[PDB]
Design a protein around this ligand. Structure first.
Ligand SMILES: Nc1ncnc2c1ncn2[C@@H]1O[C@H](COP(=O)(O)OP(=O)(O)OP(=O)(O)O)[C@@H](O)[C@H]1O
Lengths: 406, 133, 385
């Protein structure tokens, strides 16, 4: 019966009906439904490809962006009638454009996203070059939002596995990984940058973006995003440039997180804040640099690790199938016309009675404050020369235990 | 030892040696109309009792000196030892003097004399004598 | 007057309209310069390759279906011994048919490549080689003298890239008769080779230093022409890259959209679907929007933009017909919207014939106009006084 129906030229008639008549969306819904029923017939594929149904489906999707049923049926269909000819020699830009646009416009509809990602995986099964096109036409937004939402909203293991498989096949090339990493660093998307770093995507990819840490610091980023870049590979010069930029746009947390790598030696409980020519010092900037053992490490962002493990698993499957107070506070080359900020009570005054040495030579200080020298109760090595002093304070000797005053 | 833009491509040379295509005689060779790279050109072929010295005597002026009053060389071969130069639209001055002595307005005569004098002055300023005018 | 004030009207010698609804993908010219001025066309309107013969002096179109899959590229081989002439075809399936230019009953296939054959460029280094570029980044070097055999094997199957990277960018060098290095293109990488068949250079191009036009700079290479540098065009790329053959870096980046902006005002899909380079005068860019860009090869100048004759330029190449050379065969797809607005299949493939002197006449004609204008002004002034 199916063969007789096919021989009756049903496909030609239905394609002509739904192609010649681009208005009246009801006939479009009926035609997409009829084609969807047609495709799973034994002989459907060859005649459907010869008639050129694919162009009709793509045009239908173009003229009806806002309707839901047309988009769902078309996205389910596209993967069904896709062939190697349709993506021949790497050409498939209208496909990627329509798929990404449809997925982005309807981001919350689970069925539309499921059909679209199944279609995308089916296309990637044919030609791997298509992924490049997807990356070009902003597939990143859809991928990232879906991977965030699926974990945040109801958990679907099959849908998450599909998304991770698509992401793994997209991230085969190192250049594609770099592009996705840069675009994810442009947005405040710290949840996934950890995953991308785990996959690869070295953080020293300077192509007019200069230093990633610096550029992400410019666009008012979250501290956890800067932390991921700092923990991974980052050149010292770029970190210092980011420090200068963050000094320009004064933010306590980013400055503290940068100084945590630039100048801190927890092994020898020492701060080496030397030649980093910061024009001023504030209690908030070097507050978190103190140990604060009461605060403890917290690992709640296991999502990135699980996603990276699943992506790596899919990639390899495809490959095989075919006290301790820190006491050395140093501020020497800093252009410091005043250190009055440390005088006021803050979190610094909680840990300054143990400093046990301080370096302030080669600056522009004058008249070392009374409150600060009355705060430090164990400063046993205080050197401060090449400053613009004009009279000996004579209250520096009121400290509890001081030696080697210079 | 010459610029590489003057070497013949025998695949692009439609040349037919015949008395019907003869344009004129020369000092030691004869010139025939032909086609080179899809354009009407003139091919000068030398004689059996000749040598490379005559070809290099042609080339010492045709390959190093460029002027609006001197004929332009398009190619110069070695295996049959021919030259490929421009084609004058209106022919030699002998035909004009003998057959067509009616278009020789005094302006045309003055222009011809001036152009020949300019060519001679260029040749003589370029350390080269002509000896056959 | 404005219609007659154009060089497009002086140097467009012939215009041929092919039969209704035919999609021809590649063309070659039967060019022995004395045998028969004609064109061979590879149709692609159906998924079964058709070879068609176009007699130019009679405008006679004769098609013939011989290939299971659509023909991608064509090449003409002329063996001077015994005055042998043959034409070789490259099908999407992977086969390689060889049929005589004169005889019509000389069909004989060859080795079936792994995948589609994207180039068949043939040239002589001396020895003549018929270079077969498979769609898997594989240049299967073949011997011209071996085309007589009914089925054979490539002399040296070179490998340039994986299946993901296609090799579809064969070319040669016409400067100083340097018929030694034939700069090609595999995927997004430019490769070079000599008669030693050793890769002297394999340069990566997918990275753009500016990283702004990298959207158009991360596509497969489609055409390369070399006179003093490298000219690179890519799929859906409004940019063309002028790369240095010594420092191996991007010297220049010419924007086709920048030159088209003057004529469009009166998402720009101004792609570069083909590119041809005239000897020493100008550069002929063929756009996917139906425009033709004549650029001054000297440094940068735009000689002219030609439009309102096609909807999309497909194949641009230089031929010689009937002892009258200097004819830039241009094939375009005139797709009238009479059938419908859904891009219904009503496509006239127009094979127009130009004269590559065209970059010259532009200046000539404009100078003419300027002189006449001046004369007019002078006369009017003499009228006033
Ligand atoms: N109508 C014509 N069209 C073209 N050439 C003509 C015509 N009439 C005569 N000729 C001849 O064609 C030749 C064109 O000049 P050309 O550049 O070939 O000079 P040439 O061969 O170097 O000269 P010469 O014979 O004095 O050595 C001349 O010999 C000229 O007499």
């Amino acid at each position: 019966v199916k063969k007789q129906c096919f021989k009756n030229d049903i496909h030609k008639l239905v394609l002509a009906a739904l192609n010649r008549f681009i208005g009246n969306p009801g006939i479009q819904k009926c035609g997409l439904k009829v084609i969807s029923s047609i495709v799973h017939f034994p002989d459907a594929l060859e005649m459907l490809s010869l008639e050129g149904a694919m162009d009709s489906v793509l045009h239908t999707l173009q003229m009806y962006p806002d309707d839901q049923e047309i988009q769902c049926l078309g996205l389910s269909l596209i993967g069904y009638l896709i062939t190697k000819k349709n993506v021949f020699i790497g050409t498939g830009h209208l496909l990627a454009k329509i798929l990404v646009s449809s997925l982005y416009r309807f981001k919350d509809v689970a069925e539309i996203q499921t059909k679209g990602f199944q279609t995308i995986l089916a296309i990637l099964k044919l030609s791997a070059s298509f992924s490049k096109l997807l990356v070009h036409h902003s597939f990143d937004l859809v991928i990232f939002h879906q991977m965030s939402s699926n974990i945040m909203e109801q958990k679907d293991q099959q849908f998450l596995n599909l998304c991770c498989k698509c992401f793994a096949k997209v991230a085969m090339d190192d250049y594609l990984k770099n592009v996705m990493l840069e675009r994810a660093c442009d947005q405040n998307n710290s949840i996934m940058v950890e995953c991308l770093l785990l996959l690869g995507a070295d953080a020293n990819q300077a192509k007019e973006g200069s230093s990633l840490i610096c550029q992400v610091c410019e666009k008012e980023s979250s501290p956890k995003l800067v932390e991921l870049l700092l923990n991974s590979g980052s050149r010292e010069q770029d970190v210092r440039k980011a420090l200068t930029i963050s000094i320009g746009k004064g933010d306590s947390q980013i400055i503290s997180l940068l100084l945590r790598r630039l100048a801190l030696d927890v092994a020898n409980n020492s701060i080496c804040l030397g030649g980093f020519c910061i024009g001023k010092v504030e209690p908030s900037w070097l507050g978190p640099l103190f140990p604060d053992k009461t605060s403890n490490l917290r690992k709640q962002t296991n999502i990135a690790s699980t996603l990276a493990r699943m992506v790596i698993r899919y990639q390899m499957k495809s490959a095989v199938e075919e006290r301790e107070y820190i006491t050395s506070l140093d501020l020497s080359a800093n252009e410091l016309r005043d250190i009055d900020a440390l005088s006021q009570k803050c979190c610094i005054s909680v840990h300054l009675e143990h400093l046990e040495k301080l370096e302030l030579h080669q600056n522009a200080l004058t008249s070392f404050p009374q409150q600060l020298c009355e705060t430090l109760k164990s400063l046993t090595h205080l050197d401060l020369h090449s400053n613009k002093f004009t009279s000996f304070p004579s209250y520096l000797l009121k400290m509890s235990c001081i030696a080697n005053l210079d | 030892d010459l610029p590489r833009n003057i070497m013949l491509n025998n695949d692009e040379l439609e040349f037919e040696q015949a008395p019907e295509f003869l344009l004129g005689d020369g000092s030691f060779g004869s010139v025939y109309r032909a086609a080179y790279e899809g354009e009407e050109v003139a091919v000068k072929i030398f004689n059996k009792h000749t040598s490379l010295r005559l070809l290099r005597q042609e080339l010492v002026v045709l390959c190093h000196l460029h002027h609006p009053s001197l004929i332009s060389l398009l190619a110069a071969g070695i295996r049959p030892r021919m030259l490929v130069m421009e084609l004058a639209s209106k022919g030699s001055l002998d035909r004009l003097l003998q057959q067509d002595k009616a278009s020789l307005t005094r302006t045309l005569q003055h222009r011809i004399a001036l152009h020949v004098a300019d060519g001679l002055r260029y040749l003589h300023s370029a350390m080269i004598i002509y000896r056959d005018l | 007057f404005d219609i007659l004030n154009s060089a497009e009207l002086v140097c467009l010698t012939r215009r041929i309209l092919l039969p209704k609804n035919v999609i021809v993908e590649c063309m070659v010219a039967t060019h022995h310069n004395s045998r028969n001025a004609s064109i061979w066309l590879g149709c692609g309107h159906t998924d079964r390759g058709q070879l068609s013969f176009l007699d130019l002096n009679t405008e006679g179109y004769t098609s013939e279906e011989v290939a299971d899959s659509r023909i991608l590229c064509l090449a003409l081989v002329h063996l001077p011994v015994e005055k042998e002439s043959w034409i070789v075809s490259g099908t999407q399936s992977g086969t390689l048919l060889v049929i005589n230019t004169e005889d019509g009953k000389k069909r004989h296939t060859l080795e079936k490549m792994t995948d589609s054959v994207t180039c068949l460029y043939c040239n002589s280094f001396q020895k003549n080689f018929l270079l077969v570029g498979t769609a898997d980044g594989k240049l299967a070097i073949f011997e011209d003298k071996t085309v007589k055999l009914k089925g054979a094997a490539p002399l040296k199957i070179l490998n340039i890239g994986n299946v993901s990277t296609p090799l579809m960018c064969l070319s040669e060098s016409t400067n100083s008769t340097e018929r030694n290095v034939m700069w090609g293109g595999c995927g997004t990488k430019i490769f070079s080779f000599s008669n030693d068949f050793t890769i002297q250079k394999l340069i990566e191009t997918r990275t753009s230093q500016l990283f702004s036009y990298a959207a158009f700079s991360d596509s497969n290479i489609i055409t390369v022409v070399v006179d003093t540098a490298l000219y690179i065009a890519k799929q859906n790329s409004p940019v063309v890259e002028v790369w240095d053959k010594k420092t191996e870096k991007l010297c220049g980046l010419i924007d086709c959209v920048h030159f088209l902006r003057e004529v469009t005002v009166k998402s720009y899909s101004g792609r570069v679907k083909t590119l041809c380079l005239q000897k020493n005068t100008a550069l002929w860019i063929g756009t996917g929007g139906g425009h033709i860009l004549l650029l001054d090869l000297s440094t940068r100048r735009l000689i002219r933009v030609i439009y309102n004759f096609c909807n999309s330029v497909r194949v641009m190449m230089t031929a010689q017909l009937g002892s009258l050379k200097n004819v830039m065969l241009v094939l375009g797809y005139n797709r009238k919207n009479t059938e419908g607005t859904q891009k219904q299949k009503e496509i006239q493939s127009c094979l127009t014939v130009w004269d590559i002197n065209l970059p010259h006449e532009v200046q000539n004609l404009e100078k003419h106009i300027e002189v006449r204008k001046e004369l007019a002004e002078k006369m009017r002034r003499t009228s006033v006084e």
